[PDB]
């Protein structure tokens, strides 16, 4: 059972997020302040300056030598039980595809832990669960959103060879992509070219246009393009320098000086109120809140709020979590959909309606669902 004052600490940490979100839904839908080109300049700022400094602020204050490794294995066994059953679904059943393996992995295992999970669980359970949610944000940024980037690059590099080398691709020796090309999925004309050698060998060169390969060829092609999406990504620099500093700042006690700890904190203090303002600007620019259909908005919000936590009840118990760490682990799994899984689905067109329903409609029912777990778990 919960006390009525502990319900006030949740509202103290969550109602400020929805105030910032309805003021931005109002300033576009209702009172017409922002032009949709002006409105896309605030999303630009948040995606590059505010969230990479908000995620730096949390990761650099983490202690990487005192991470709860029993709790941390229950979150990384959710994402193996899910990802094994998807691997044993696309290979067995003939209707399974790789476009749904990426969608069902985002919809069921990757929540919004950074902007709404750290403020939410800090009010519900205290300062330790706001320290455990930082440890998940470290592992999503550095492992699970950099695996999911391999699954989008593999999805792009498999279409281009099935469309253009349908009967010859068993003889490709190397694939060189020109350095101009960043995404080879449905965006650029991509004049590819092959080089027939003296014995059936084949050198492929993907170029920019104007007017089954061996696994040693594809896994050289994927790692090139993953590297070109990883140094242009602003949250890799937030995650590299955040982990590099906290491995130094917590062994030799080197406290970061107040020139630099305040130069970062002048834009990172913007980051949490600007993320919710940017998220409410996005749900106003879309024509419908439920966009994917009503039979798929009940599917996007059953993978998230039911299949999400019910696979961390078979994983958080097999690891050995009990008490409050079981209750923190289930409630963090029922958080709404993270936005970085949508940002990949917008770029690659792997169901951008289901992953925009689940972000937008997930936020609106996020609070009365996680409060429903917070009542049922304590009883």
């Amino acid at each position, epitope marked *: 059972m919960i006390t009525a004052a502990d319900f006030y600490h949740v509202m103290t940490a969550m109602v400020p997020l929805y105030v910032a979100m309805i003021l931005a839904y109002g300033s576009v839908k209702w009172w017409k302040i922002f032009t949709p080109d002006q409105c896309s300049g605030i999303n630009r700022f948040v995606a590059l300056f505010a969230v990479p400094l908000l995620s730096f602020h949390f990761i650099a204050a983490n202690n990487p030598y005192a991470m709860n490794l029993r709790f941390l294995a229950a979150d990384s066994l959710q994402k193996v039980i899910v990802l094994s059953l998807l691997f044993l679904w696309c290979k067995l059943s003939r209707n399974g595809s790789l476009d749904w393996t990426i969608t069902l992995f985002s919809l069921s295992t990757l929540p919004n832990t950074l902007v709404m999970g750290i403020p939410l669980l800090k009010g519900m359970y205290g300062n330790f669960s706001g320290d455990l949610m930082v440890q998940i944000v470290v592992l999503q940024c550095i492992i699970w959103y950099t695996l999911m980037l391999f699954l989008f690059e593999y999805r792009g590099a498999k279409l281009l060879i099935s469309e*253009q*080398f*349908p009967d*010859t691709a068993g*003889s490709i020796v190397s694939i060189h992509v020109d350095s101009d090309i960043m995404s080879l999925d449905g965006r650029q004309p991509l004049e*590819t*070219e092959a080089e*027939i050698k003296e014995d059936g060998k084949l050198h*492929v060169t993907v170029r920019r246009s104007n007017a089954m390969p061996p696994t040693s060829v594809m896994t050289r092609l994927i790692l090139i393009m993953v590297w070109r999406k990883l140094i242009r990504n602003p949250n890799s620099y937030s995650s590299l320098f955040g982990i590099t500093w906290s491995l130094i700042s917590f062994k030799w006690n080197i406290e970061m000086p107040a020139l630099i700890a305040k130069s970062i904190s002048i834009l990172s203090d913007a980051g949490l109120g600007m993320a919710m303002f940017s998220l409410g600007l996005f749900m106003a620019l879309n024509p419908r809140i439920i966009a994917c259909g009503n039979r798929r908005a009940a599917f996007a919000a059953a993978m998230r709020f039911v299949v999400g936590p019910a696979v961390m009840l078979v994983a958080s118990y097999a690891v050995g979590l009990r008490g409050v760490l079981l209750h923190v682990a289930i409630i963090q799994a029922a958080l709404p959909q993270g936005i970085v899984p949508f940002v990949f689905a917008k770029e690659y067109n792997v169901h951008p309606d289901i992953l925009s329903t689940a972000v937008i409609f997930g936020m609106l029912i996020a609070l009365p669902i996680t409060l429903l777990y917070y009542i049922l778990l304590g009883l």
Partner: nanobody, 115 residues
């Protein structure tokens, strides 16, 4: 099959001679005709020359060599020739064909040299 291009016809020739290059296609799937030809000097910024495209209706000749380079198709032999006349001295570059079967496959072996 291990599909292979064969190119020949290149050699040493003075200005104003006559050449007839070869592009022997063998081993392909169903070939949509977009067999091209272009030049390549050791300097960059290459430029396209000809085409024998879809029905032989219109070819794409360059504006500098329009109407003077004769291109022709034999579907039985699967070989497209490129006849050259009034050979200008800026034709020492390599001339190789670019058969398009969805991805442009091309070879390298000629020695078109005009002195």
């Amino acid at each position: 099959s291990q599909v292979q291009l064969v190119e020949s016809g290149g050699g040493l020739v003075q200005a104003g001679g006559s050449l007839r290059l070869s592009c022997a296609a063998s081993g392909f799937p169903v070939n949509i005709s977009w067999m091209e030809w272009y030049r390549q000097v050791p300097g960059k910024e290459r430029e396209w020359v000809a085409a024998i495209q879809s029905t032989g209706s219109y070819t794409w000749y360059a504006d500098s060599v329009k109407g003077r380079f004769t291109i022709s198709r034999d579907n039985a032999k699967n070989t497209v020739y490129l006849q050259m006349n009034s050979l200008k001295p800026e034709d020492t570059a390599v001339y190789y064909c670019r058969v398009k079967v969805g991805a442009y496959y091309r070879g390298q072996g000629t020695q078109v040299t005009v002195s």
